[PDB]
Design a protein around this ligand. Structure first.
Ligand SMILES: [Zn+2]
Ligand SMILES: [Zn+2]
Lengths: 465, 465
């Protein structure tokens, strides 16, 4: 099982080689290869993620923005390079004039900086930090396309930071803290000396002025910022730091976030976001001038960062590493309510309790699937549900639950990779719903600390079970 | 003053003819005409709107989805028409194969329907209702472009509904109820017999089979559904109904939502969303077959609906009709905290109170701007703020507020178009923040009823004042 299987099973995406009813042709012969089509299970995950990541960044001091999806190629001519980059871009014509489907957000984010400088000059605080849940498109050859990992259109948790020399170490370190918070609290992935690695890619000093552009002062200023931040990371968590001479991009040095994971029992890297310094953009958009003239600042840095990276790619690796198991906030189905019918008259109270709990949870904003089952069918109903829908929380309602007034409630424990059984007492349906909602609130609690609010985007996904 | 002015002043968008610092060229010579660039004030409005509209639709029973931005033109060949529509589309090549930047969501939404039918057949409920905050691009000539009203890329509160004959009247009526809820609760616009009109556009029966496609049964079934729903609307609200023979689109009849507004003192229409029946799509995507074969249903309807329509367009007209005044949830600046310094030692308590209230509101997730002012400067500081930033709530902190322990708090009343003064007692900073937060919660209350949660996307916009 790959993410491709898990994505189809949880109904996060449409499978490109599934046949369209009545047409019998693959969905991909309508949509194009490499264009992931998110489905009904995937919709709420995408809104929820945007919402959490936007609020998380706003609480950490980033200005959240949404930038256009197309642009004149003048925009990408000014940024560079552009005889090269042209080749990864989808271009088109309006009306003689050349336009592109945006392959990156950076130029737009710098325009927004430039617009605020123009209106407010030095009243604008620095560091200036702008975040976007941004939608980018790039040329990928048909043979390069693979599931959700390499695609033609995808989303990034993209940010740009314009930071003076005196605050740059703290900003780098903070982004690391951001990565760690999102991993631990949204995804329930532990970040520590045993699971995480930071990789620095630096210049070769002999080649500054040629394969690495810019001046020595630039490179040393940035490389030292990455070494100091990395040194604080290592001191606080014992996370190990790797440094590669001559691996930087031509426009500045960088840091990569790497999770260490294991098969089965193979040790592997799972590469995530990045902190990329840029010496090209501040020249091409005259940022050095602007910051010197308006703020009197001579040492400033420009930085691209993503915590997850490509969101599709992150979700893909995540589906595989976690075998389809989503954190509660992002689970297509949050509560699966399972009525275990017996044949007898107790079925009426079972069916009323299940139905009422189901409506109550939906009113509270949860994603809920009701499944009718039986004592003899239960075993194979559950097996089907666990192998496919993987609901975050199963609630079993049988004769026993009705007579004892205790729900049988099974939350999936992401660390142990096992269900854990809770016995939740209730007086009546209303009260069962309150108590289930309380459990959910405990499961949403880490996300509330990132973003203030856990998103409730309700749905009745009964038809999936 | 047009929306173009209000949008620039509230920092919702970048003005295309503003000059880029240091370059002195217009922003538009980088971006392209007709491509609205939302700015820092506009970012949180866009996330907030997506979030509220998505949750509102999920609570009303729509499945929320996000569909790709590009697609093979096979997708638009199957839907029609396509020698015609080709001309409004941005097209491009991958790798020999023709692709388009999506001009509409409909084909994608039908693929998602078809995908669920394939996996779950008749377990899928009907009506099937899918909602998307969707991003669409269309060719518009340079002379057609105007502000936010006619643009090249824009967003819709788009939905598709596949409804059997027996439930179609209720669905039409419900969409109307949706329009009314969003207007009244998100936008604080009254919808009644004095302010609202519903326009039906129908076939000419003599031309069914020619300028209006489909069969008589189709048209009569749909036109009666619109007349019955309209008749219920009129009975419940006395809203007047207008019916035009021969104005329907070639593929089915429709209903348009129209607000009646006034200058100055001219009566004008403000056209909003639509309910469009479609007889073409169910043929082109073989939906009639699919619904008959899988559900045994012979009478079914396919419907496109938007409540706002183009979101950019709606926001534009809104900015003009309300002279820049946003509802609290959508206001770029939610609380403006204004320290009225005196020169004396009381300035220390004024500055500490303002500062603490400001940090406290930010922690609660609000968008906050602090302005330092003086007794002599106040008058012209406020005038500048009211003419430009238009904060939802002004909080004045002067010597008097400190000595009496009562804040001077001015909420803008959207109906009367005037500030209204509240006297809010406090014991200390913490308590002032609780009491301000309570006022905000009262202002967020109508949005909580649409969507369960009012979005808090915080920002420090001090630099704007
Ligand atoms: Zn970038
Ligand atoms: Zn449509």
């Amino acid at each position: 099982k790959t993410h491709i299987d898990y994505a189809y099973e949880l109904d996060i995406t449409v499978k490109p080689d599934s046949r369209v009813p009545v047409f019998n042709r693959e969905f991909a012969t309508f949509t194009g290869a490499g264009v992931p089509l998110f489905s009904l299970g995937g919709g709420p995950i995408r809104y929820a993620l945007a919402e959490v990541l936007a609020k998380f960044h706003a609480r950490r001091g980033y200005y959240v923005v949404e930038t256009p999806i197309i642009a004149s190629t003048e925009l990408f001519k000014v940024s560079g390079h552009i005889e090269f980059y042209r080749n990864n871009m989808y271009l088109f014509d309006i009306e003689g004039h050349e336009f592109a489907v945006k392959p990156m957000n950076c130029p737009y984010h710098i325009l927004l900086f430039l617009n605020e400088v123009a209106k407010h000059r030095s009243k604008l605080p620095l560091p200036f930090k702008v975040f976007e849940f941004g939608r980018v498109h790039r040329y990928e050859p048909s043979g390069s396309i693979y599931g959700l990992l390499r695609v033609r259109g995808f989303t990034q948790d993209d940010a740009h930071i314009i930071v003076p020399g005196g605050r740059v170490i703290d900003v780098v370190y903070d982004v690391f803290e951001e990565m760690k918070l999102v991993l631990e609290r949204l995804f329930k992935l532990g970040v520590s000396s045993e699971t995480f690695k930071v990789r620095l890619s630096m210049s070769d000093k002999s080649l500054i002025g040629k394969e690495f552009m810019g001046s020595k002062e630039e490179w040393e200023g940035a490389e030292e910022a990455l070494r100091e931040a990395a040194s604080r990371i290592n001191e606080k968590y014992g996370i190990d730091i790797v440094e590669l001479e001559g691996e930087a991009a031509f426009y500045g040095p960088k840091l990569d976030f790497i999770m260490m994971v294991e098969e089965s029992g193979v040790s592997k890297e799972w590469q995530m976001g990045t902190i990329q310094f840029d010496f090209n953009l501040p020249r091409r958009f005259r940022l050095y001038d602007v910051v010197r003239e308006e703020f009197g600042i001579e040492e400033v840095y420009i930085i691209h960062r993503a915590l997850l990276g490509s969101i599709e790619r992150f979700l893909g690796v995540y589906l595989e590493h976690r075998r389809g198991r989503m954190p509660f906030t992002l689970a297509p189905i949050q509560f699966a309510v399972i009525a275990v019918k017996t044949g007898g008259e107790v079925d009426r109270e079972i069916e009323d309790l299940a139905s009422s709990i189901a409506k109550g949870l939906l009113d509270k904003g949860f994603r809920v699937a009701v499944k009718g089952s039986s004592k003899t069918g239960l075993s194979s109903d559950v097996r089907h549900i666990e192998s496919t829908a993987k609901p975050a929380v199963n609630v079993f309602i049988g004769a026993k639950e009705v007579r004892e007034k205790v729900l049988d409630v099974r939350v999936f424990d992401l660390e142990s990779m096992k269900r854990r059984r809770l016995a939740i007492a209730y007086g009546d349906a209303a009260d069962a719903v309150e108590n289930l909602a309380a459990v959910a609130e405990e499961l949403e609690s880490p996300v509330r600390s990132l973003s203030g609010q856990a998103p409730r985007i309700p749905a009745d996904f009964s038809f999936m079970l």
